[PDB]
Amino acid sequence: TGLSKEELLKVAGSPGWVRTRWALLLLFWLGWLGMLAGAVVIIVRAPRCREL
Amino acid sequence: VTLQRNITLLNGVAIIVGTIIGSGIFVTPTGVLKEAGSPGLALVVWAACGVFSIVGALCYAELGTTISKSGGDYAYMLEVYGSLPAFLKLWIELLIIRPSSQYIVALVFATYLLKPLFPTCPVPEEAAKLVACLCVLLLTAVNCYSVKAATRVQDAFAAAKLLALALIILLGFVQIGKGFEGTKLDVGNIVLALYSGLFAYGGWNYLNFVTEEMINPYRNLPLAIIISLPIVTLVYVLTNLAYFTTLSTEQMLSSEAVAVDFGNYHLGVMSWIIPVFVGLSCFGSVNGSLFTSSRLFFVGSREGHLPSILSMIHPQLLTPVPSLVFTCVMTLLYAFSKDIFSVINFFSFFNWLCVALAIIGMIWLRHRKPELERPIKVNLALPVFFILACLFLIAVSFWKTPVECGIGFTIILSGLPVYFFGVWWKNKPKWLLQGIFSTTVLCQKLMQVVPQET
Numbered sequence A: 001t002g003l004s005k006e007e008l009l010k011v012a013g014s015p016g017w018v019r020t021r022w023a024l025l026l027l028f029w030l031g032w033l034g035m036l037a038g039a040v041v042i043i044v045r046a047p048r049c050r051e052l
Numbered sequence B: 001v002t003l004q005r006n007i008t009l010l011n012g013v014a015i016i017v018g019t020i021i022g023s024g025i026f027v028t029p030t031g032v033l034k035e036a037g038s039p040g041l042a043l044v045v046w047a048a049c050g051v052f053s054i055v056g057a058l059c060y061a062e063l064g065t066t067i068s069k070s071g072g073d074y075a076y077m078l079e080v081y082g083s084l085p086a087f088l089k090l091w092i093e094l095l096i097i098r099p100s101s102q103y104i105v106a107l108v109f110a111t112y113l114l115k116p117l118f119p120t121c122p123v124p125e126e127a128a129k130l131v132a133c134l135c136v137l138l139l140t141a142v143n144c145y146s147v148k149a150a151t152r153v154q155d156a157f158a159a160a161k162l163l164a165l166a167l168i169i170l171l172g173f174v175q176i177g178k179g180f181e182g183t184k185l186d187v188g189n190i191v192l193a194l195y196s197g198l199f200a201y202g203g204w205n206y207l208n209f210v211t212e213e214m215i216n217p218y219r220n221l222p223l224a225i226i227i228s229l230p231i232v233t234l235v236y237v238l239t240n241l242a243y244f245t246t247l248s249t250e251q252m253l254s255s256e257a258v259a260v261d262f263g264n265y266h267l268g269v270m271s272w273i274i275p276v277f278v279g280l281s282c283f284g285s286v287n288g289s290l291f292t293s294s295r296l297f298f299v300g301s302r303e304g305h306l307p308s309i310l311s312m313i314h315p316q317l318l319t320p321v322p323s324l325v326f327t328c329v330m331t332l333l334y335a336f337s338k339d340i341f342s343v344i345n346f347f348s349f350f351n352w353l354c355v356a357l358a359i360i361g362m363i364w365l366r367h368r369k370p371e372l373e374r375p376i377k378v379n380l381a382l383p384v385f386f387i388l389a390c391l392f393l394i395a396v397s398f399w400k401t402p403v404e405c406g407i408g409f410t411i412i413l414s415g416l417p418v419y420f421f422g423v424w425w426k427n428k429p430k431w432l433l434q435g436i437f438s439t440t441v442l443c444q445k446l447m448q449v450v451p452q453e454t
């Protein structure tokens, strides 16, 4: 079920949607550096191995 | 608006030497000594997998060149056996094999990348799952924003792989500079010894899923395979030799992580280098599978089996974004599981029977259609040799290890309901079709994506 480029691009450029994409594609990139902060916290908080 | 051709000969060997080298050589050589009994038969088994891979992969230059459509194993299957046989494969690829293959490599990326900070105990399990997901997400983004970036990343990690094995091998010959054993003959062990090697070489079949993006396929695809697969075989048997220059046979039979032992033996002040190289090897293999699998499900959408949203390309960025997001999201589900490994050990056979059915299909296609153009032709003796050896190593090894087939065939037959609902159907439930269209245009407006214009 294909739908036309020249149909979609009547709606796809509208202010609410381009704002929505900037919001989500920022929230994702913030979520990812959130994964990184979470992991680095766990790695620092975890007790390191016994010495041989 | 179509997937723009961007893969060179150079990046075309990076995708294959990229996906092959992986974790296999650094953590599965113990898995051949445990069956072979001896470093003598081990060096043979590691060479025997090489030639068997080369004949297989050159038999894949036939399917590669004769059918440009680049669903790889799935397109070649659809072209011969038709819609339902190909769909059960694509369902298995979608649901189990391709997400779990990415995820366990993401986990293996974590446990080795973190090992320099955890030198003698398990890494914190939650940290390992977070770092696994950070890898799959970062490589999904690096695949969305440029195919030329993604393949430059494949190049970078193909270099990282060959640096790692060069460092192993030169220490091997330095160790030799300072100056075979009793062996089994039982075929019931030899098939298991050899089958344990086919995991390491596995992945030569990957380049075929991206042929439609490769810039001059009738040269570049055949030439990439024969450039790569000999250099894979050489660094593999020389790496497998290098381990026996340093490690006692009894040590390797025990070893949790063979490359870490070799690194700790020689480089003790800075041995953490080798864990980092095996980690970065795995990172590049996640990329290999993301890149390659998103093209499979794109093809599976445009060849009319899968839901339509997965066909839709981003028209400014020229990447099949919903298929990259779909494979990312399917991968991250596996982080929310514990030790599914027994069914994965079953489905490891399913890929080999797909290679068998496809390459059987190559002769079947040769006899039913000698009219076709064939930009290269293969001596029929090589498929005749390869198909029997493949079906032997499937059949005998399966009889020795039918590990979880009760759940295995539970999953395989679960594709047939979805075929009757999604591919066979006469589309009677019009209330659902309004939802299908609505959610489709939602995804198209959200992701900003447009179908393949044939």
Ligand SMILES: N[C@@H](Cc1ccccc1)C(=O)O
Residues within 6 Å of the ligand: B019, B020, B021, B022, B023, B024, B025, B105, B199, B200, B201, B202, B203, B204, B285
């Ligand atoms: N050889 C790959 C594993 C693999 C097996 C089978 C198919 C594809 C890939 C690795 O070591 O990462």
